[PDB]
């Protein structure tokens, strides 16, 4: 039997599925530690690896990329879980090794791959506290090319009025994604700052793990794929909408939660956004 | 040596697949990759190479190739 993780219901993705919209033909790059494409609850259509010591993108020694992939597009069937956009085409763009670490140049190579292979959506459930000119340039280019880029805001919590939002989420072109629990409360680890754009479920998020298993993790990284999948749903229903239009709808129709320093525009509502 | 990203000025030289390589390669630097969409290159550099590069009319910046982590 299939379970529907609470976060998937929380952003109102099932309403889109009932309308007949599930992310079909929308190409989503998972720029992460790889995706174990042997998982029976996942379909992976392609990808590439820029991690020098781990050149097969369909192997994931961290589990992070597989878990993110399942929140985005775990298959709608009789097993495991359900992703936000279960018919989306997933691409394994491996830029982190099995420890979940990656050089910025590898990440850039992964983003450039996404550009060159006409991805519709990029998910980056990763960041660091350091900025990079090359990184900004590449993310800005992906966005000016028409690609939706969702980035984890970071898990550095709050520090008085100083922004703890990491990179590349800090840059204006990306959609920075914070984390809320099932009560719509900000998780205390979720980074804060005026760069925050939206929140999504990021506490106790059940999804796919390598080896055909399932498990829950917490993080703005688990929150991010909710937003990448939301984008996939919206574009499967509005295939002419640009990335800026997708973003504007996700933010303008978000459920207000409070002070935008801690919550951005609030919790995404994919049902409202895709009206 | 360290892991760096070397960026180039829009047209004030070096972009070209070869003068880019050349630019870094002839300061001790070593190139692992030339970015397709970014006017930059991932390279390995000693301290001398950094100083020379930063001061090249073709170079806009010399930044450390930082290490991110799963968020
Ligand atoms: Ca399933
Ligand atoms: Ca941003």
From Swiss-Prot, chain B:
| The organism's place on the tree of life at top rank | Bacteria
The record describes the protein's role as: An extracellular alkaline serine protease, it catalyzes the hydrolysis of proteins and peptide amides.
Question: Can you say where in the cell this protein is located?
Answer: Secreted
Q: Which residues form the Inhibitor I9 domain?
A: 3-68
Q: Which family does it belong to?
A: Belongs to the peptidase S8 family.
What's the protein here called?
Subtilisin E
Q: What happens when the gene is disrupted?
A: Wild-type sporulation, cells have only 10% of wild-type serine protease activity.
Anything else of interest in the record? Secretion of subtilisin is associated with onset of sporulation, and many mutations which block sporulation at early stages affect expression levels of subtilisin. However, subtilisin is not necessary for normal sporulation.
Induction profile: Transcribed only during stationary phase, under control of the sigma-37 factor (sigB).
**Could you give the domain comment from the record?**
The propeptide functions as an intramolecular chaperone which is essential for the correct folding of the protease domain but is not required for enzymatic function of the folded protein. It is autoprocessed and degraded after completion of the folding process.
Identify the coding gene.
aprE
């Amino acid at each position: 039997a299939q379970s529907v993780p609470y976060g998937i219901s929380q952003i109102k993705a099932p309403a889109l599925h009932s309308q007949g919209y599930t992310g079909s033909n929308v190409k989503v790059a998972v720029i992460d530690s790889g995706i174990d494409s042997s998982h029976p609850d996942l379909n992976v259509r392609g990808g590439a690896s820029f991690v020098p010591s781990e050149t097969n993108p369909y192997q994931d020694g961290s589990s992070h990329g597989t878990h993110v992939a399942g929140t985005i597009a775990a298959l709608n069937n009789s097993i495991g879980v359900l992703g936000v956009s279960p018919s989306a085409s997933l691409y394994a763009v491996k830029v982190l090794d099995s420890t979940g670490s990656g050089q910025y140049s590898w990440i850039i190579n992964g983003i450039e791959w996404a550009i060159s292979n006409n991805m519709d959506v990029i998910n980056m459930s990763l960041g660091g506290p350091t900025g990079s000119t090359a990184l900004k340039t590449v993310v800005d280019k992906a966005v000016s090319s028409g690609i939706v880029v969702a980035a984890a805001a970071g898990n550095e919590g709050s520090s008085g009025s100083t922004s703890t939002v990491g990179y590349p989420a800090k840059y204006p072109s990306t959609i920075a994604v914070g984390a809320v629990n099932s009560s719509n409360q900000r998780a205390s680890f979720s980074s804060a700052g005026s760069e925050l754009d939206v929140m999504a479920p990021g506490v106790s998020i059940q999804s796919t793990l390598p080896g055909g298993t399932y498990g829950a993790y917490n993080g703005t990284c688990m929150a991010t794929p909710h937003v990448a999948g939301a984008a996939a749903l919206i574009l499967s229903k509005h295939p002419t909408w640009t990335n800026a239009q997708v973003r504007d709808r996700l933010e303008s129709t978000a459920t207000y939660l409070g002070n935008s320093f801690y919550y951005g525009k609030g919790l995404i509502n994919v049902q409202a956004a895709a009206q | 040596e360290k892991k760096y990203i070397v960026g180039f000025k829009q047209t004030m030289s070096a972009m070209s697949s070869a003068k880019k390589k050349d630019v870094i390669s002839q300061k001790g630097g070593k190139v692992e990759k030339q970015f397709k969409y970014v006017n930059a290159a991932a390279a390995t550099l000693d301290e001398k190479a950094v100083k020379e590069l930063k001061k090249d009319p073709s170079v806009a910046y010399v930044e450390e190739d930082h290490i991110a982590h799963e968020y």
